[PDB]
């Protein structure tokens, strides 16, 4: 027996979602952050709101920005959101993709000159994952060929064919780093479960443009892989980092990471039909899901962010962990049936309009701190783009579209 929300409610949250895309989200990015100096768009917004046309701009960050506007104009049509996914477009490849050595540089200069030159599996994912949304809502064919180089280049030079999964970061000619570090924050462990969550997420993503039979195979021993060496099911957590042959080299929770990869396991399965795989995944997502709700929520229902490798809980609110357990908690619902997941969404949603969406400076606030105070940190920066909060309004959209379905036409 079913147990849903009304349609009135469904409906009144996809509004309240669509009208956060629409008017704040995609509005702020649509006007604070393009750059007419330097073309593209600027790589750091302050506290204050000031946008920073010199600062340096980073290759995830401009992935992101053409991921988003190209989704959005995918699934909305708005002749803006195009003309900004254009505009990223244009830049990125004028500037980040490396026409020697192939792949993305990890840093450039605001006017393009490479700044970092490194290749990092990160970063080299955000482009596939991009650069094939790109060409699902254009047919642009450069796009597609240039997402096809840069799965060519990981497989080349990054994957580990004696232990699975990919070694993370290269130098520009593609050697090898020692530093696999995204940043000063991470483990300097050889593996992480961040990286190839990305590298998943972008295959998944390239499979639906492209599909290719060795994808394919690639896409599964991923999926694999997150099943064997990273999932955890004593605890319903992901392991962060691990060696080169997936031994446990952390202890920390990241709730955020937990819940985007709830989903995204289900999405990268169901692109490629793997039938046999399924319910695995489908359990591990719903028991990721459920530890989610169990230990990583404050009582207004927000995420909080880490247990640390000491143990203790970081009880800051970030920006993404709040997008992706809207996410996770409705893929939750649709999955297990159980309402619990579509409150534990709402009572999200709720805490994303009354305390992390900045309503005095657009967009959102990146941190929030246990007593509610917003914490002054930069709008927009090198880590901090449009997608996991563009992402989830149009996910959320979506999924909320199918539920409001289970009213039969008559
Ligand atoms: O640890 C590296 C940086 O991660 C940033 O958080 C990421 C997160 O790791 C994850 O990949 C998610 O999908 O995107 C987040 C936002 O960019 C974090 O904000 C940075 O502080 C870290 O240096
Ligand atoms: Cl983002």
Known sequence: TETIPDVRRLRALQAEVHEELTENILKFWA???????????????????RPHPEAPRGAILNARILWTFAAAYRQLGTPLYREMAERAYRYFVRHFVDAEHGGVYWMVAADGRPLDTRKHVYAQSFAIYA?????RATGGEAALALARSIYDLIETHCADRVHGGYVEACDRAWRPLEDARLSAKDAPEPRSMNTHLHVLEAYANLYRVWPETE???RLQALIELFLRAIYHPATGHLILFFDERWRPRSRAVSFGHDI?????????????????????????????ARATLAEGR?????????????????????????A??????????????????????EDVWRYIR????????????????????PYPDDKVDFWKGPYH???????????????LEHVRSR
């Open 354 to 373: 009354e305390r992390q969406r900045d309503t005095r400076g657009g967009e959102w606030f990146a941190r929030v701190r246990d007593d509610g105070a």
């Open 131 to 135: 650069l094939s949304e790109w060409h």
């Open 389 to 403: 909060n563009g992402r989830a309004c149009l996910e959320a959209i979506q999924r909320l579209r199918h539920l």
């Open 260 to 288: 985007e990869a709830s989903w995204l396991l289900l999405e990268a399965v169901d692109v490629l039909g793997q039938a046999t795989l399924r319910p695995r995944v489908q359990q591990a997502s719903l028991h990721l």
């Open 31 to 49: 006007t604070r952050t393009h750059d007419p100096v330097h073309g593209g768009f600027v790589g750091r917004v302050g506290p204050d709101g």
């Open 298 to 322: 404050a009582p207004d229902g927000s995420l909080y962010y880490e247990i640390g490798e000491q143990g203790h809980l970081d009880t800051d609110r970030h920006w993404w962990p709040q």
């Open 215 to 217: 994808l394919a195979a």
């Open 324 to 345: 992706e357990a809207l996410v996770g908690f409705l893929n939750a619902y649709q999955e297990s049936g159980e309402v619990l997941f579509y409150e534990a969404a």
